[PDB]
Amino acid sequence: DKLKKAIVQVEHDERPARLILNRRPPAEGYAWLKYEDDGQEFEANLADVKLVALIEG
Amino acid sequence: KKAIVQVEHDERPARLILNRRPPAEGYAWLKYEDDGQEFEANLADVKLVALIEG
């Protein structure tokens, strides 16, 4: 019913990533994401990020 | 202290309900800030706005 932890799957620059929920935004409307293909964390303007899926961690 | 993921649907602010399982892949449950109504949305039609971190 209930997800205890969730992964917010997104896309940025054509690549699958997830939002890092526990890292503060660097600027208004931005967030840190982690790309799935290399595990690197980077800042993104949320206006340029598409939501893909919500699944259990 | 839970994270809050702020979005917009039909130009109205809302949040993703992070603790409720979606019924279908690429969909989710959202709650409008203005009336508290919970509803199903296709994430393709949902704009991400801000993160309040956990």
Tokens of B35: 């009336």
Q: How many domains does chain B have?
A: 1
CATH number for the domain harbouring residue A4 = 2.30.30.150
Q: Considering only residues 23 to 52 of chain B, which have any Cβ-Cβ distance to chain A shorter than 8 Å?
A: 25-26, 28, 43-44, 46-51
Taking the C-alpha atoms of B3, B44, A28 and B6 in order, what is their torsion angle to the nearest 10 degrees?
A: -40
Strands (E), B1-54: 4-9, 12-16, 27-32, 38-42, 47-52
List CB contacts (< 8 A) between B41 and chain A: none
Q: Resolution of the coordinates in A?
A: 1.7
Contacts of A28-31 with CB under 8 Å at 24 or more apart are A28/B50, A29/B49, A29/B50, A31/B50, A31/B51
Give me Rg for the CA atoms of chain B.
10
Whole-number Å distance between alpha carbons of B29 and B33: 13
Q: Which domain holds residue A4?
A: 1-57
Is B54 touching A (CB cutoff 8 A)?
yes
Instruction: Write down the experimental method used for this entry.
Output: X-ray
Whole-number Å distance between alpha carbons of A28 and A14: 23
Residues A51/A45, Cβ–Cβ less than 8 Å = no
User: What is the number of other CB atoms lying within 10 angstroms of the CB of residue B40?
Assistant: 11
